[PDB]
Design a protein around this nucleic acid. Structure first.
Lengths: 88, 70, 135, 128, 74
RNA sequence: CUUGAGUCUCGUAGAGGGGGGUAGAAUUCCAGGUGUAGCGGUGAAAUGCGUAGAGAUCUGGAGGAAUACCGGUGGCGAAGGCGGCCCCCUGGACGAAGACUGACGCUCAGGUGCGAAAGCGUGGGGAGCAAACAGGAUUAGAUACCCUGGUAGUCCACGCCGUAAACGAUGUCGACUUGGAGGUUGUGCCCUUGAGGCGUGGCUUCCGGAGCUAACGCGUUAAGUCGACCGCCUGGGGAGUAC
């Protein structure tokens, strides 16, 4: 779940300039905004484990498409992760 | 369990058939009996289970025409 | 935006409180750019069971659309409103804003079965005849 | 307890209508006649018929319990009746016949046998 | 004319009353015994879904005192 | 590349999860009203409660676990698991058009997260029921069973090792194999001629064919034909203990 206007902002800034959602950089950036909102909820609500199962799904598919991206272009990869302010 | 729904025309004998729709069953039936949590889903809800003897009967009707028992 | 259908009733004698409460409930909703698509009062009705004693109450369908944060503040107000005896607000899925199922009964209540009193004139000042503060 | 009284003629308040309450258990019936506003005008029981066992809890003992109490209240001057029923035990209908046989109308047979919103947990009893 | 969808003599012999509207008192008493509780979908011949939603809308209604919760309130 | 899968918005069914709000009914309780001799238990019975006024019953308040009802072959979860109604945060799956990426895939030791149930530390809560305990009853023996008294417990919040028959004791995901129909729902079409009919998806189920079984049974949701990868078993007793 993400807001319509957050979904349009991601598409404007990430992937190519065609404004698709389908691509490996932009799918990584669209998952990302939802992982970050859910980690907001899960600042409290500390007994909510059966939904936390959903975070580990959203994270895991992101681990697979960043694994794919690094087997391909190092420019797209090294640019994305720093331009999207991701991980620690 | 004379059942609160009123019998069509009042008489000294309660019309127990015409009264119940979902009263006493599961709620006041297992009186002085051990309460289970999840057994009732399969234990009491037996409406499909009780239809099968009627179906078996409605099948054997047809076969009695074909055998010339009928 | 998402639609939340609030229906509530008020203890007759305490109805004199609500014309003050409604004008705030509308100023917090239209203050968030929401809408009221009717706000229908049905008149005084018989309860099936008493709530805080008395067998009568007066029934009001507000029929809000509001963003979700504002409805969250309104169910807590209306539930703890002392004049309100009980209130219900229902889910967004399959929600109506037209063609009410109680259109006749509303007219029967207001025309005949009502209180006929000053304490429900105040209720009608909270009813279709809504007056509300300026935004 | 009971006294050996001369034949009865007596008047009390001539109230004409009442409610009866039938509290049905496994071992007994308690049958209790009240005023509509809700005050004991008299009672009888199945257990004072001194059957013992399971045998106290049969429709014929439920009938005669109803007949003792309905009788006694002819001095209270009741002429019409209603009953509330409270238990799952036997004398479903045979109690109703004794209230009618006392010469009262008994048109409203309201079962009020209370279903709590899942209340207090019952004794476990046999392990089947 | 096309897409008429319940003209006449089609879906059910016995008419469907509400789904999730709960504001009329007479439509809800269609599924309430005098003991004060919602009737099974096998007795009415509802399809189970329409009944699971009504079960919420009637309960919601009851709690708002449109309906009796118990036999003791007759 | 799409022939695998992945993603965006739209729609849909349900008791999925976590925190908030909220009414009424029995036992139970305080007060007040009414009222007289038994009540309870069981094969039968005694212990138990009662004339110091019981038992039952009416009126008003009280409190808490719980939510009686959705109750059906329904739907959801992770197996076990989930059922009052609302609001807030939010998962997972089922459809459909427009559209995009293009093996980004399968499995998973280790692993971190996560409890049916009771066990359980502090806080909160406590009404009934109850292991033990006591006494009756059985003689049928263990204070067990069975009955009456009766406590921890059961109940919530957070927290500790996650136990079992842990479930379709049918691993995961995917490919292939005559179908009709029930329950019931997205959606294309119909006077929706009957929880109806056909097109095509959805879980869920009855029947039975090819194949598969020692036998019941399974059968398109396999226990068939198979695919990879992982998990586990190798005679009884003694041991789910010992090390």
């Amino acid at each position: 779940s993400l807001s319509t206007e957050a979904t349009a902002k991601i598409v404007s800034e990430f992937g190519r300039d065609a404004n698709d959602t389908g691509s490996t950089e932009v799918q990584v950036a669209l998952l990302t905004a939802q992982i970050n909102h859910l980690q907001g909820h899960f600042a409290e609500h500390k007994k909510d484990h059966h939904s936390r199962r959903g975070l580990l799904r959203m994270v895991s598919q992101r681990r697979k498409l960043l694994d794919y991206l690094k087997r391909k272009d190092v420019a797209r990869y090294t640019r994305l992760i720093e331009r999207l302010g991701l991980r620690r | 369990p004379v059942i609160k729904v009123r019998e069509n025309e009042p008489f000294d004998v309660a019309l127990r058939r015409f009264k119940r729709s979902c009263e006493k069953a599961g709620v006041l039936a297992e009186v002085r009996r051990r309460e289970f949590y999840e057994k009732p889903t399969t234990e009491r809800k037996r409406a499909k289970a009780s239809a099968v003897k009627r179906h078996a009967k409605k099948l054997a009707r047809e076969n009695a025409r074909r055998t010339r028992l009928y | 935006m998402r639609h939340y259908e609030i229906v509530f009733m008020v203890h007759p004698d305490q109805s004199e409180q609500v014309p003050g409460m409604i004008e705030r409930y509308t100023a917090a909703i239209t203050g968030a750019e929401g809408k009221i698509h009717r706000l229908e009062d049905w008149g005084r009705r018989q309860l099936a069971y008493p709530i805080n004693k008395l067998h009568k109450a007066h029934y009001v369908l507000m029929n809000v659309e509001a963003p979700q944060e504002v409805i969250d503040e309104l169910e807590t107000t209306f539930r703890f409103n002392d004049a309100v005896i009980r209130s219900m607000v229902m889910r967004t899925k399959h929600a109506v804003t037209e063609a009410s199922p109680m259109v006749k009964a509303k007219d029967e209540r207001r025309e005949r079965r009502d209180d006929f009193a000053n304490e429900t004139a105040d209720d009608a000042e909270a009813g279709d005849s809504e007056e509300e503060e300026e935004e | 307890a009971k006294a050996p009284i001369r034949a009865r003629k007596r008047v009390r308040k001539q109230v004409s209508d009442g409610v009866a309450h039938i509290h049905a258990s496994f071992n007994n019936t308690i049958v209790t006649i009240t005023d509509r506003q809700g005050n004991a005008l008299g009672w009888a029981t199945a257990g004072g018929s001194g059957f013992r066992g399971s045998r106290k809890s049969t429709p014929f003992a439920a009938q005669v319990a109803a007949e003792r109490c309905a009788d006694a209240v002819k001095e209270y001057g009741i002429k019409n009746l209603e009953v509330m029923v409270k238990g799952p035990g036997p004398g479903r209908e045979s109690t109703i016949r004794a209230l009618n046989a006392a010469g009262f109308r008994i048109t409203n047979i309201t079962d009020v046998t209370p279903i709590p919103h899942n209340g207090c947990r019952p004794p476990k009893k046999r392990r089947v | 004319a096309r897409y008429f969808r319940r003209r006449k003599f089609c879906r059910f012999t016995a008419e469907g009353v509400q789904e999730i509207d709960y504001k009329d008192i007479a439509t809800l008493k269609n599924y309430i015994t005098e003991s004060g509780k919602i009737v099974p979908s096998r007795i009415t011949g509802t399809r189970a879904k329409y009944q699971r939603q009504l079960a919420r809308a009637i309960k919601r209604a009851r709690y708002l005192s449109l309906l009796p919760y118990t036999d003791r309130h007759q």
